[PDB]
Amino acid sequence: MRECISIHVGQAGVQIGNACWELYCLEHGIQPDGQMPHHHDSFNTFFSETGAGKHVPRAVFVDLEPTVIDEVRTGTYRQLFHPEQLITGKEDAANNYARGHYTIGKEIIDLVLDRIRKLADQCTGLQGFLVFHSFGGGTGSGFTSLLMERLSVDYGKKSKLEFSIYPAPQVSTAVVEPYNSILTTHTTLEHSDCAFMVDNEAIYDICRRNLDIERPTYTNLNRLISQIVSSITASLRFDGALNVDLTEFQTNLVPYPRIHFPLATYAPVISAEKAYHEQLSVAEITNACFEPANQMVKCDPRHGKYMACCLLYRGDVVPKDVNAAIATIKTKRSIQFVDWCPTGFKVGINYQPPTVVPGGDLAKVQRAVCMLSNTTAIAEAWARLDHKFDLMYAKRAFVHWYVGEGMEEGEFSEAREDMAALEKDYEEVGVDSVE
């Protein structure tokens, strides 16, 4: 009765959604065809139901290249999705923000908004939106900027959560990542309620070091991020000793309107062969979450200050142990919050344990904790992008595509100014107060 739709833009969004919906169907014992042989309703928040025992997701799959969507239509989760949700374009933006925001996406945006409005009106207690999109791809950035603007125009005050894929400092599959990233950030900065920074480089490191898988496929990273998002929405979708809604997330983790970029982290992540030999203490897993090597963004947290933290626990958890572990974390020195925020934690506890996907890589654990942490180290990452942008702009490289596809140079200058202003605000927050 507290619904929240899902929106998947771009190839990354669609693949992540594949993983996430596999995980959901496993959580609620739902067949790929929508049938089903502590639980409350629970699945009602993400599954709508027809007369028969068939349930459908509240998701929208939009893309400009029909390849991946066609794979979904042919995927084992074929009978699941309502066929109208699979909006396919004809020619992808091809890692060009201009195409993805002015030329191509502009011509299906209306149909996308139509389906969005249909699914919204069919629901009653709509909590908000979940956007799954990359950052470098043309469709992702462009269509996402357009979609966020349209939604903010239409649905003024409702939850809008985003899951970007922060481009890695060194592993850049595309070449024009800085341009698209800068443009999409400069646009989305005034509409997104709360983003969720995740990067593939950190996930590679985590998969190799912890899970002891040397050669991972994209499916594995998708499984990890799906686990994170499932932990995020378990509070809505399940009964817990201390529940929490997305509104609480945006309220607690966003001190200033512009600074709403918290990074993700999850634990425990160990191989099934290594499942034993460790009791998985709640304080232990909390320390694991706070370790710089277990974070999912390549940024040393010791270089910044945790402006806010949100720890969400599920499984056999007891509040006093959580309190003790959090107090111990506060005692440590290298974790220095901002002076003006003495209360740097919101906690969430759930009874439903995390579910391990058969054919997966993780081990069945009795407890799990996801930390969404808004820190100051992320500012440094922006600097890197800044740098690259200047380079690719000092020579006016690649500019002609963007210019000829519905954009002006002054827009690029303005986006650079906006990113510089954001970095300035981050520094301004980083200082301490007098008196």
Partner: protein, 429 residues
Amino acid sequence: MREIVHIQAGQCGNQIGAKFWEVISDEHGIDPSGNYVGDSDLQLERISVYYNEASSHKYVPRAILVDLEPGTMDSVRSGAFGHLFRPDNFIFGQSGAGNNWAKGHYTEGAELVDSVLDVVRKECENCDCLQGFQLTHSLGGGTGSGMGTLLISKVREEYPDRIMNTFSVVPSPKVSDTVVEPYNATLSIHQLVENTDETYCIDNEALYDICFRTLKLATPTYGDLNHLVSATMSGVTTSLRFPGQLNADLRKLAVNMVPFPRLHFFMPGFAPLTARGSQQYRALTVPELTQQMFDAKNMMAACDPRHGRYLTVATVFRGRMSMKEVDEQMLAIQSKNSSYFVEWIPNNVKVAVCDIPPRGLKMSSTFIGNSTAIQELFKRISEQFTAMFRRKAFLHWYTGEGMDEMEFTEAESNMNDLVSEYQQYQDAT
């Protein structure tokens, strides 16, 4: 007669209330279906103070459960001891306060408060001679705090004569379960010192420590803490829900414990508290309970009383006992702790005695201390507030609902005025 109406705001309020009604029904011998199967007539001699006799000889709690989200409401409804509440009382919203006080007091709450007041009025008219209201809520969560303050203001407008009790879960000193709780706490305290007859400050940290140290439980689930607080409240009301050699009511406690209108914040305590094995190895004597109730390690508010003075003290016993024993114990405890009491209030202990133990035990005791130590709490909060208000963090979330900075300015000024008064009376001479 003296019918009492129960209000439960916020998730914490609802959970505490569920445990509370469980305890009350257990005291009165009430089946989960809501019908009586008890054994002692005295149970039903005053069943009407908390229950209403619905036709076909059934009983319903005189409670009003309020929320802005269906989650915990439905959780309780599905659970046992849920099918006895009258379903029309379950008022809930859909938007959810989002742990914001502005929503819970200006925008979202303003839409349900009317229906809530209507149900309140219906229940009031059902009662014969209304005694007063007890509100069960938190101070951090947006719904509990905001909507409870709104309802308190409205009720006090509609009932400037009845009595008002609030059981607020004050934020812990060390940990902080949320991030913006200083703002909600400050605004809630503003409204409480405005229009509340008495407020029972309670912390989860102290309950954790009591369960761990005293009861020897390393696995305290929220059910245990809620059970403890519910036992406390039941002990508070048993003085009128049952006969007694020296009976008391809510009005008597308010008269005795509130020398000045604003200074109506109380730290509670309970006794005896024994482990499962370490119980038979101790004598259950009135002096033992009395000495137990006077120490830092058994106060449900995280503040050492030795830091201040006991302005007033109330104590409610249960079960059969000898009055002279209680008198001597109170005399001795007031003599030995001479430095810990206000000079200009001699004999500052109120005593009440019941005839029924809370079941299972021979004799129990409840302590309600109005001290000057608690000011530290407020001081702490005030400081935090100033910090978070100096940089105006999160200020936009509350601004967007119509609230303005001057609201926080006034609330902080009021809190500092209260702190000044508390300190002034601490070192009075």
